[PDB]
């Protein structure tokens, strides 16, 4: 992975920028040392209570002379301590403000330039650059990578500096107050980073093992959901359910172990930090007995070294964000500092005013930059006189278009020169070059705006009258005036779709506005019907007036009209001259003449569900039984600690017997270790409980989901919100993430309720008033913690919603770069881009200020809490209310309690995302379709007859109930005879074939098979005797023998039936010939096949089950040569003795069909055989007339 030098990355920072960064970082440093200072002050605080405990403990000394020496002393010490706390806090709000504010600011300002210059630099690039580069990733790079470099030069490094400042402040204060203790603790430190470092590698080892573990089931998951039509139709729902399931009990059972080891990681972390607590206090408390360190000093250094330690662990992502922001900056600055071969932005060439317009190509050798290996033009020589029109032909290769492309100087030739008049095309400014060159491409392209605006894109300073005139010159004025909004009518991608001819004509006009003296037509008439081609070419021929035109037309119809016809054999020009010369020479021209004669949309919709999801995992009670208890234990562990820490520092603050100072000390210290041991037990138990549950719950769930997915209707798979990829992603992720809302959430809620719940009881008994204070301040701070992330993500989505404006402009500009580069107008699109960006950047100031005041409001009172609680508590202890140790207990219990609930909240997966990934699962499972392929009811007669009779049957698609497809059309087919369907297009050419296979239910009316109604029959058994052949036959990546046997399921097909079905599908020839027999895989994983053979296999598939009803729906549309012969030849020998229905557009193999039904609109208007309908001279006469 690549990365920029740190110095290079801030290149677009200026005066004010460096200023902001420096001021900010400076405030970040001092914000950093605020916490260690806080620690020291805390030590100095506890030292003071330690003095008043011991004297009033032992016996009785002076009753009236204690209130003066103890009570009066402490208040005098706390009135100043308060000033310290509060002082530091008040400073902290300011300096934190400066930090986030300035860093966010300077970052934003930089980024604004960065994105702009990235865009301009993308525009600057020639097309040769867009050949070698994917435009999709480039356009997303302008949004993703720039937003990615925004993060890493902003708040993140501010916090990095705060963090390193806390590291240095903490270790400095550490060693200053305490030489030894800090070295003890720092001695303990390398055993936690060595522990966190091996356990991350362990969890991450299984994480990527899982990705390619489930991807075996995901394969057959997308394989099924893609070919789902061919699945339900061959009823392989059972087999595919099984097949999918066999790859589940191998890839989540792999996950079980990983869940366990990650749980043991957590356990070991806890055991280790608790070991650290134990050892540190065992040292320090025995150290305060020898009267070396004070009790408060031990606290000071333990806490400042500890805080200084976790500083690193909360600097890690802040420095990581800086790192990969450099790696993203690489790609962007590469383009910005890249100057192309064709610029194409500034003028350095000439701008002839003659301007003549004589073309010349001398010895042109050229090859595309994507594939230098293959040479395109070899010694290309071609002159074009003024006003003369030259057509390019020969059907050689790309070369044709290449010349056109070379003419507007998209690329440059490898050898040889392209000269307009006396000067080379390279000696003239490129902007002015494409201003004097107009172009019409094979595919028209209109930008999303008004027609007027699309026209402006050819020339900016054009009056409305010039516009109208230009439109008229394009024979386009007519249909534009017929539009509802005239010249303000929307076009392009979204809104108001226009035909290809009109769309092309507007482009013709656009080009015409430029008034070029040279005109290039690359397959202008191509890809158009014969009725619009006339009008379009009418505009073109009038556009060729006064202009030097070179035209390439696949249709040589409009070619003869040219002055000079130039043929292409290979890379060289061979035959050149007038039409008659090339006809007489019988060249290549003569040859050709004779031969041609959704992500948000998903999660928005579902309502529900509050805790019903737990019913899903309820299949295993034991695991949850152990689980919940284990969490109550690990949850009571935390309040325990706060008590035990308060008894450690209590035995030296509340005085008493010195001989018992040790006995207590080592007891509590050792006790901490015990509290760690048990802590390692819970987490080893939890991952064996919830861990397996949530994983079992995963497997089973997926199974259920997949099953239900096969139950569904065909209408559901027509739903624009349910795609093979979206479905398989619903199966892959949401199905696994469901475990978040079950066990994990019980763990969380129980650990939290155990912690803050019991801790609040204890802090309530050890203090009435102070507890009331903390259960008041703490929630208020917690509320601020929510709003902090509310106003953070809140104006994070609002900022992207105003940024989509820029996104659209850039997108439209990039996706059609190859088009805009021809109309120049690159700088215009840049201008649009900046104009779009001027609104979010004006909101960067307010943004930075907001993040400032928010971060500062949350962070300020994080010190004012200590300020309040320790002042009120001192107020307690000094008076008759007791004591201080209890004050410290209430504080630690409630505060680290509330902190612990936060960390427990951060451990488990996101409950919101879990629930919304759960509701899709539960809805998908409990989903009952109309047509149930799983039902075991049904007639199942012995009657092998098989008469299809549609009566009435009015049907319209549920996906889009607009313009009903079937309007109650009726027909009937008896046994052996073959129906045929004739109409303008599909619907209901295919709709019938679908309704007989019962993919949909017609609104009113009924279709009968034999004497019985379809709806009365068994659903599955109905398709058991119906073979189906679609336009594009799909096979399964399993094997050939299975593909063939896939036709008749629930039965042992074996060698015999497969060879029998192979031999009449005539495919048996292709089988032995190609190594090897029946074991070969189709397709794209094994050997590739042509459509013909694959469809032959497909027929052989629909032939195994011995169907009494064939359904042929536009069988082969892409099959040519003598391949379509053997296909229908194999079709004809299996058609006899079978009820068949054929839909084709061929109309050549329908003359031999038994019944021919001409369906139009929503009914049947013609009926009978071929010659009968033909002699009827209706619409069948007019449709079979286009066969010449």
Ligand X SMILES: CC(C)[C@@H]1NC(=O)c2c[se]c(n2)[C@H](C(C)C)NC(=O)c2c[se]c(n2)[C@H](C(C)C)NC(=O)c2c[se]c1n2
Give me the residues paired with residue 951 across strands: 1006
Nearest to ligand X of 641, 1180 (CB atom): 641
Q: Min. distance of Cβ 642 from ligand X in angstroms? A: 8
Q: Is 638 in the site for ligand X (CB under 6 A)?
A: yes
Q: Does residue 135 contact residue 821 with C-beta atoms inside 8 Å?
A: no
Q: Is 270 in the site for ligand X (CB under 6 A)?
A: yes
CA 136 to chain centre: 13
Is 397 labelled a binding residue? yes
Q: Min. distance of Cβ 185 from ligand X in angstroms? A: 11
Q: Min. distance of Cβ 225 from ligand X in angstroms? A: 39
Q: Min. distance of Cβ 802 from ligand X in angstroms? A: 36
Q: Is 669 in the site for ligand X (CB under 6 A)?
A: no
Q: Indicate the burial class of 755 (C-beta count within 10 angstroms; 0-12, 13-18, 19 or more).
A: buried
What is the Cα–Cα distance from 979 to 1138, expressed in whole angstroms?
Answer: 11
Nearest to ligand X of 349, 909 (CB atom): 909
Q: What is the largest CA-CA distance in the chain?
A: 135
Q: Is 269 in the site for ligand X (CB under 6 A)?
A: yes
Q: Does residue 283 contact residue 160 with C-beta atoms inside 8 Å?
A: no
> What is the rounded radius of gyration, in angstroms, for the C-alpha atoms of the chain?
40
SS3 string, 744-790, reads HHHHHHHHHHHHHHHHHHHHHHCCCHHHHHHHHHHHHHHHHHHHHHH
At 68, phi and psi to the nearest 5? Answer: -85, -35
* Contacting residue, 130, 175, 310, 479, with ligand X by CB under 6 A: 310
Is 630 labelled a binding residue? no
Name the token pair of 471: 């439109």
What is the Cα–Cα distance from 737 to 740, expressed in whole angstroms?
Answer: 6
Report 330-349 residues binding ligand X (CB under 6 A).
none
Sketch the per residue contact string, 767 through 806, with ligand X: x for CB under 6 A, - otherwise. Answer: ----------------------------------------
Name the token pair of 951: 């009566």
Q: Does residue 331 contact residue 1 with C-beta atoms inside 8 Å?
A: no
Is 400 labelled a binding residue? yes
Is 53 labelled a binding residue? no
Segment lying near ligand X (by CB under 6 A), choices 77-85, 689-697, 899-907, 1090-1098? 899-907
* Contacting residue, 37, 289, 899, 1034, with ligand X by CB under 6 A: 899
Is 990 labelled a binding residue? yes
Segment lying near ligand X (by CB under 6 A), choices 693-701, 849-857, 894-902, 1003-1011? 894-902
Is 985 labelled a binding residue? yes
Is 1168 labelled a binding residue? no
Q: Min. distance of Cβ 187 from ligand X in angstroms? A: 17
Name the token pair of 176: 């200053």
Q: How far is the CA of 178 from the CAs of 172, 182, 904, in angstroms?
A: 10, 6, 33
Nearest to ligand X of 379, 757 (CB atom): 757
Is 892 labelled a binding residue? no
Nearest to ligand X of 675, 987 (CB atom): 675
Nearest to ligand X of 20, 896 (CB atom): 896
Segment lying near ligand X (by CB under 6 A), choices 218-226, 825-833, 853-861, 892-900? 892-900
Name the token pair of 338: 């890249």
Q: Min. distance of Cβ 742 from ligand X in angstroms? A: 20
Name the token pair of 495: 């809104």
Nearest to ligand X of 166, 679 (CB atom): 679
Is 117 labelled a binding residue? no
Name the token pair of 1061: 């079905």
SS3 string, 674-698, reads HHHHHHHHHHHHHHHHHHHHHHHHH
Closest Cα partner for 636 from 774, 759, 746? 759
Q: Is 641 in the site for ligand X (CB under 6 A)?
A: yes
Is 195 labelled a binding residue? no
What is the Cα–Cα distance from 279 to 187, expressed in whole angstroms?
Answer: 11
What is the Cα–Cα distance from 896 to 903, expressed in whole angstroms?
Answer: 10
Nearest to ligand X of 162, 990 (CB atom): 162
Q: Does residue 1000 contact residue 1178 with C-beta atoms inside 8 Å?
A: no
| DSSP assigned state of 424 | E
Report 438-457 residues binding ligand X (CB under 6 A).
none
Nearest to ligand X of 97, 750 (CB atom): 750
Nearest to ligand X of 308, 413 (CB atom): 308
Q: Min. distance of Cβ 889 from ligand X in angstroms? A: 14
Q: How far is the CA of 50 from the CAs of 55, 82, 627, in angstroms?
A: 9, 18, 43
Q: Is 900 in the site for ligand X (CB under 6 A)?
A: yes
Nearest to ligand X of 316, 835 (CB atom): 316
Is 987 labelled a binding residue? yes
Nearest to ligand X of 271, 392 (CB atom): 271
Q: How many CA atoms lie within 13 A of 1155 on its CB side?
A: 18
* Contacting residue, 766, 896, 955, 999, with ligand X by CB under 6 A: 896
Is 655 labelled a binding residue? no
Is 988 labelled a binding residue? yes
Is 790 labelled a binding residue? no
Report 206-265 residues binding ligand X (CB under 6 A).
none
Q: Is 903 in the site for ligand X (CB under 6 A)?
A: yes
* Count of Cβ atoms closer than 10 Å to residue 341 Cβ: 11
Number of residues lying near ligand X (CB under 6 A):
14
Q: In which element (H, E) is residue 1081 found? A: none
Q: Min. distance of Cβ 203 from ligand X in angstroms? A: 12
Residue with the two structure tokens 């902190």:
899
What is the Cα–Cα distance from 496 to 482, expressed in whole angstroms?
Answer: 13
Nearest to ligand X of 907, 934 (CB atom): 907
Q: How far is the CA of 273 from the CAs of 166, 267, 1032, in angstroms?
A: 20, 10, 64
Segment lying near ligand X (by CB under 6 A), choices 520-528, 636-644, 734-742, 1000-1008? 636-644
Nearest to ligand X of 899, 1147 (CB atom): 899
* Contacting residue, 344, 537, 679, 878, with ligand X by CB under 6 A: 679
Q: In which element (H, E) is residue 369 found? A: none
What is the Cα–Cα distance from 1035 to 230, expressed in whole angstroms?
Answer: 9
Angle value at C-alpha 829, between 828 and 831, nearest 5 degrees: 65
Q: In which element (H, E) is residue 714 found? A: none
Q: Min. distance of Cβ 105 from ligand X in angstroms? A: 30
Sketch the per residue contact string, 904 through 943, with ligand X: x for CB under 6 A, - otherwise. Answer: ---x------------------------------------
Q: Min. distance of Cβ 930 from ligand X in angstroms? A: 50
3-state SS, residue 704: helix
Q: Min. distance of Cβ 897 from ligand X in angstroms? A: 9
Segment lying near ligand X (by CB under 6 A), choices 181-189, 206-214, 576-584, 897-905? 897-905
Dihedral over Cα of 133, 137, 140, 142: its sign? negative
At 556, phi and psi to the nearest 5? Answer: -70, 5
Q: Is 637 in the site for ligand X (CB under 6 A)?
A: yes
Q: Min. distance of Cβ 307 from ligand X in angstroms? A: 6
* Contacting residue, 100, 306, 390, 931, with ligand X by CB under 6 A: 306
Nearest to ligand X of 310, 957 (CB atom): 310
Segment lying near ligand X (by CB under 6 A), choices 55-63, 201-209, 893-901, 1111-1119? 893-901
Q: Does residue 713 contact residue 897 with C-beta atoms inside 8 Å?
A: no
Q: Min. distance of Cβ 738 from ligand X in angstroms? A: 23
* Count of Cβ atoms closer than 10 Å to residue 879 Cβ: 11
Binding residues for ATP: 394-401, 983-990
Binding site for ligand X (CB under 6 A): 269-270, 306-307, 310, 637-638, 641, 679, 896, 899-900, 903, 907
Binding residues: 394-401, 983-990
């Amino acid at each position: 992975k690549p990365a920029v030098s740190v110095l290079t990355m801030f290149r677009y920072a200026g005066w004010l920028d460096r200023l902001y960064m420096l001021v900010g970082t400076l405030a970040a440093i001092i914000h950093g040392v605020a916490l260690p200072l806080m620690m020291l002050i805390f030590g100095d605080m506890t030292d003071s209570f330690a003095s008043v405990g011991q004297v009033s403990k032992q016996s009785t000394q002076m009753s009236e002379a204690d209130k003066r020496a103890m009570f009066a002393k402490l208040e005098e010490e706390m009135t100043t301590y308060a000033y310290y706390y509060t002082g530091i806090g008040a400073g902290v709000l300011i300096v934190a403000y400066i930090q986030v504010s300035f860093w966010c600011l300077a970052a934003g300002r930089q980024i604004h330039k960065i994105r702009q210059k990235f865009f301009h630099a993308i525009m600057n690039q020639e097309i040769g650059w867009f050949d070698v580069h994917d435009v999709g990733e480039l356009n997303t790079r302008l949004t993703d990578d720039v937003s990615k470099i925004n993060e890493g030069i902003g708040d993140k490094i501010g916090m990095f500096f705060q963090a390193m400042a806390t590291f240095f402040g903490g270790f400095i204060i550490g060693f200053t107050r305490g030489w030894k203790l800090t070295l003890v603790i720092l001695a303990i430190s390398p055993v936690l980073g060595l522990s966190a470092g091996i356990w991350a590698k362990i969890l991450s080892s299984f994480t990527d093992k899982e990705l390619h573990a489930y991807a075996k089931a995901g394969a057959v998951a997308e394989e099924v959901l893609a070919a789902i039509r061919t699945v339900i139709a061959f009823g392989g729902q059972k087999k595919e359910l099984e097949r999918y399931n066999n790859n589940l009990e191998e890839a989540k059972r792999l996950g079980i172990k990983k869940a366990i080891t990650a749980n043991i990681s957590m356990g070991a972390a806890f055991l280790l930090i608790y070991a650290s607590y134990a050892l540190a206090f065992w040292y320090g408390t025995s150290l305060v007995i020898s009267k070396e360190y004070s009790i408060g000093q031990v606290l000071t250094v333990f806490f400042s070294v500890l805080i200084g330690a976790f500083s690193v662990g909360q600097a890690s992502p802040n420095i990581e964000a800086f790192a990969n922001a450099r790696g993203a900056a690489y790609e962007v600055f590469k383009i910005i500092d890249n100057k192309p071969s064709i610029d194409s932005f500034s003028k350095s060439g000439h701008k002839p005013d003659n301007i003549q317009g004589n073309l010349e190509f001398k010895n042109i050798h050229f090859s595309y930059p994507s594939r230098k290996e293959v040479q395109i033009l070899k010694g290309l020589n071609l002159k074009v006189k003024s006003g003369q029109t030259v057509a390019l032909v020969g059907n050689s290769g790309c070369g044709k278009s290449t010349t056109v492309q070379l003419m507007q100087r998209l690329y440059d030739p490898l050898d040889g020169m392209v000269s307009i008049d006396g000067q080379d095309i390279r000696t003239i400014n490129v902007r002015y070059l494409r201003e004097i060159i107009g172009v019409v491409s094979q595919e028209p392209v209109l930008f999303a705006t008004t027609i007027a605006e699309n026209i402006r894109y050819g020339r900016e300073d054009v009056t409305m009258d010039e516009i109208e005139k230009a439109v008229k010159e394009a024979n386009a004025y007519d249909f534009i005036m017929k539009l509802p909004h005239q010249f303000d009518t929307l076009v392009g991608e979204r809104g108001a779709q226009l035909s290809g001819g009109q769309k092309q004509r507007i482009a013709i006009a656009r080009a015409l506005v430029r008034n070029p003296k040279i005109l290039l037509l690359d397959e202008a008439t191509s890809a158009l019907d014969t009725e619009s081609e006339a009008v379009v070419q009418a505009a073109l021929d009038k556009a060729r007036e006064g202009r030097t035109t070179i035209v390439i037309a696949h249709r040589l119809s409009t070619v003869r009209n040219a002055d000079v016809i130039a043929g292409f054999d290979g890379g060289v020009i061979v035959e050149q001259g007038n039409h008659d010369e090339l006809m007489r020479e019988k060249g290549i021209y003569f040859k050709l003449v004779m031969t041609q004669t959704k992500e948000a949309l998903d999660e928005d919709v579902p309502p529900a569900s509050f805790w019903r999801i737990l019913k899903l995992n309820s299949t295993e009670w034991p695991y949850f039984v152990v689980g919940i208890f284990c969490a109550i234990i690990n949850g009571g562990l935390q309040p325990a600690f706060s008590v035990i820490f308060s008894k450690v520092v209590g035995v030296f603050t509340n005085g008493g017997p010195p001989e018992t100072q040790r006995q207590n000390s080592n007891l509590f210290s050792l006790l901490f270790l015990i509290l760690g041991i048990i802590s390692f037990i819970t987490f080893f138990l939890q991952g064996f409980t919830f861990g397996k549950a949530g994983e079992i719950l995963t497997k089973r769930l997926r199974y259920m989901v997949f099953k239900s997915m096969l139950r569904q209707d065909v209408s559901w798979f027509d739903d624009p919100k349910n795609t093979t990829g979206a479905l398989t992603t619903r199966l892959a992720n949401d199905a696994a993430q469901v475990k978040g809302a079950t066990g994990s959430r019980l763990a969380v809620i129980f650990q939290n309720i155990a912690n803050l719940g019991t801790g609040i009881i204890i802090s309530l008994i050890y203090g009435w008033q102070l507890t009331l204070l903390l259960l008041a301040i703490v929630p208020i701070i917690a509320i601020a913690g929510v709003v902090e992330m509310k106003m953070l993500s809140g104006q994070a989505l609002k900022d992207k919603k105003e940024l989509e404006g820029s996104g659209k402009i850039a997108t439209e500009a990039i996706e059609n770069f190859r088009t805009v580069v021809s109309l120049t107008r690159e700088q215009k699109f840049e201008t649009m881009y900046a104009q779009s960006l001027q609104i979010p950047y004006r909101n960067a100031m307010k943004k930075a200020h907001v993040f400032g005041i928010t971060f500062s409001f949350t962070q300020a009172m994080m010190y004012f809490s200590y300020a309040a609680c320790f002042r009120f508590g001192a107020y307690l202890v000094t008076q008759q209310l007791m004591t201080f140790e209890n004050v410290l207990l209430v504080f630690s219990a409630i505060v680290f309690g509330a902190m612990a609930v936060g960390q427990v909240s951060s451990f488990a997966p996101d409950y919101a995302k879990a629930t919304v990934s759960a509701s899709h699962i539960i809805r998908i499972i409990e989903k009952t379709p109309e047509i149930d392929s799983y039902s075991t009811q049904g007639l199942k007669p012995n009657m092998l007859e098989g008469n299809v009779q549609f009566s009435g049957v009015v049907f319209n698609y549920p996906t889009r109930p607009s313009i009903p497809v079937l309007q109650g059309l009726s027909l009937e087919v008896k046994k052996g005879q073959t129906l045929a369907l004739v109409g303008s297009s599909g619907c209901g050419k295919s709709t019938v074939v679908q309704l007989l296979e019962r993919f949909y239910d017609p609104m009113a009316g009924s279709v009968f098979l034999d004497g019985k109604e379809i709806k009365q029959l068994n659903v599955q058994w109905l398709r058991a005797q119906l073979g189906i052949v679609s336009q594009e036959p799909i096979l399964f990546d399993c094997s050939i023998a299975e593909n063939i046997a896939y036709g008749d399921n629930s039965r042992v097909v074996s060698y015999e039936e497969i060879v029998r079905a192979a031999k009449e599908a005539n495919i048996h020839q292709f089988i032995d010939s190609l190594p090897d027999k029946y074991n070969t895989r189709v397709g794209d994983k094994g050997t590739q096949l042509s459509g013909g053979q694959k469809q032959r296999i497909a027929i052989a598939r629909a032939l195994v089950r011995q169907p009494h009803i064939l359904l042929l729906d536009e069988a082969t549309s892409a099959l040519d040569t003598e391949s379509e012969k053997v296909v229908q030849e194999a079709l004809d020998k299996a058609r006899e003795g079978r009820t068949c229905i054929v839909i084709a557009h061929r109309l050549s193999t329908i003359q031999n069909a038994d019944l021919i039904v001409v369906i139009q609109n929503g009914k049947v208007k013609e009926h009978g055989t071929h010659q009968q309908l033909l002699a009827q001279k209706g619409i069948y006469f007019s449709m079979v007339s286009v066969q010449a």
